[PDB]
Protein: Tubby-related protein 1
Amino acid sequence: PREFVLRPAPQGRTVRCRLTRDKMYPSYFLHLDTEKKVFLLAGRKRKRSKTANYLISIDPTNNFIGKLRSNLLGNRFTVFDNGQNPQRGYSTNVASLRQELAAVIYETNVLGPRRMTVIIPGMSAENERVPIRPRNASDGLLVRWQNKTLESLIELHNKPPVWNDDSGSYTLNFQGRVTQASVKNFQIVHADDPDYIVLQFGRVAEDAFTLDYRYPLCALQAFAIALSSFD
Ligand SMILES: O=P(O)(O)O[C@@H]1[C@H](O)[C@H](O)[C@@H](OP(=O)(O)O)[C@H](OP(=O)(O)O)[C@H]1O
Structure:
């Protein structure tokens, strides 16, 4: 589990999951969408934070594995593993410092779907993550993004919906994985391949969603990115 939720998905495979929330500060749960519904991750928003802050766990009853934190404004998020914030203790061993696993920037709509940018660490030819572990808040994923120093990173965006002449709607082909309209419905792709669906999220019921991820993402990145879409 601890291993699994941090491993990039296998080449050529789509890992399909079911994300549920309590029917505020609801809990969220992620399971593999197999007939043996194995539990992966859970998260919940902390009430006593100045900004949106979700703790993520590999124990659905409580194992702290990561955190989703928004900026003050609320339109930008960073995903961290379980390591220490360097600003809270400069003498801490570098290996114990938190890494940044993803960032999400949402465009703000006029007072519907929001356009999204997702930035993650780059991968080696070994197909493992090249970790980003800032020694202070003068570096990080959002920082590199705004500076446009994207060498060690991967940039992704939500795929624009297209006209479905059969359903008379602007939508995406979710392959039956998404059955209800929602501002949370999305596909995340790279510019180089609009058909390789890195992350798909969408509603199947009042409190249930599907979340399907592919390489280079792991389950923790996928889950946290999906959580950022709630609000
Ligand atoms: O306030 P508004 O303008 O009506 O926007 C909706 C509101 O946030 C609902 O709470 C939310 O449903 P949930 O509480 O179920 O998340 C819905 O998501 P939806 O598009 O998935 O229905 C939003 O579109």
User: Anything to note?
Assistant: The chain has one domain: 1-231.
